[PDB]
Amino acid sequence: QPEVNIGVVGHVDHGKTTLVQAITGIWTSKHSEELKRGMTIKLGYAETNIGVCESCKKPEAYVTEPSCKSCGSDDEPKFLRRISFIDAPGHEVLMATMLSGAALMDGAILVVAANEPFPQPQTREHFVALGIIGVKNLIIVQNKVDVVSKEEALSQYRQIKQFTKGTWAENVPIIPVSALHKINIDSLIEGIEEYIKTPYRDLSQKPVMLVIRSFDVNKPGTQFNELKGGVIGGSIIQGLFKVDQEIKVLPGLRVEKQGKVSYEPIFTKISSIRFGDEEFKEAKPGGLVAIGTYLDPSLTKADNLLGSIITLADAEVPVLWNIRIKYNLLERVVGAKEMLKVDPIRAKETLMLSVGSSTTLGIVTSVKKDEIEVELRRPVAVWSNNIRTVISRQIAGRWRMIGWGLVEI
């Protein structure tokens, strides 16, 4: 199973998904037919094996299949790790998912486009989201250099080398690529083999994981005798799951009693464990998994339990309706073409609270210096005290990242 979770942030159509395609081969389908005329809409997914040509020279030595006879010669390249990506979208409005997605990342790669004006809205929006949440292991990548003047791509490298200054980004290297002709990718594999190291994770910890997809495997027409179980897609972060454990989903489904609202935890047994297309008996952090369950697939068709989390059955986690955020703001709104200066929070305001993978909406009851109290539509299961969150506002119809903080219990 994949070791680590690398995110591919960046502006729209700079080719994020395409770079993922030159590295893994995989496409994100582009599906729902809509994505097929549009672009990536769900987080894309893909894995790959990285081995190295010991017996020759780098960066090219950075292989993809147990095969060195591609450069230098034969000695079956030694396997270093198997990684996984998370292709976000790029569109100014899919912000709410990409946020969500970051919660699973262990690091990232910023795909800038070589033939369009460097700090483009979303490129920045993302970047600062990254420095905000904590994803400090970053690799910037100059993509479409296969369509530019040998001057242009260097001058952009300048504007980049200059942005990457005051900001937290010391030597966040910048590896220009050609995602279309798959050129220079091996030096990218060498970057990502140096800088995006694979974090240790104490297993002993409480089994905890985030959900960002879920599907009804069942084909149109499979008979009831072999209706395969409900299936939950997401990423582990702390602990480890095993085939046949007893598990629960939070906050879980809400009931209806004449206009009332009431969420509650779903229990089931891990029917099965799969990464990529291959089945495993257990599952550990870094990667996305999919969990076969024994629950009515109705319950997780389209992607229902989106923004839900899975933990040990009989485990101690709060299903809050009201939450204490400590918090800070950006001075600007890096995400509108316009940089208008962030207005301080007024109470009785509706704000998107992005917590973990989930995306919830909520209203402001308290306004202090860096501690506001929020009332939520859909509960948040707060698994830790360390719960990072990301805070947004509907500036001009479309929502916008404006500031952050820490959940507090």
């Binding site: 009785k348 209203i363 009851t365 009332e375």
Partner: peptide, 22 residues
């Protein structure tokens, strides 16, 4: 009339009392 007013007063009250409750 007093139909009007009672529900206007009630709506004002609720909506505002909603804004106070919130």
């Amino acid at each position: 009339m007093r139909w009007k007013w009672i529900k206007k007063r009630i709506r004002r009250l609720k909506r505002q009392r909603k804004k106070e409750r919130g």
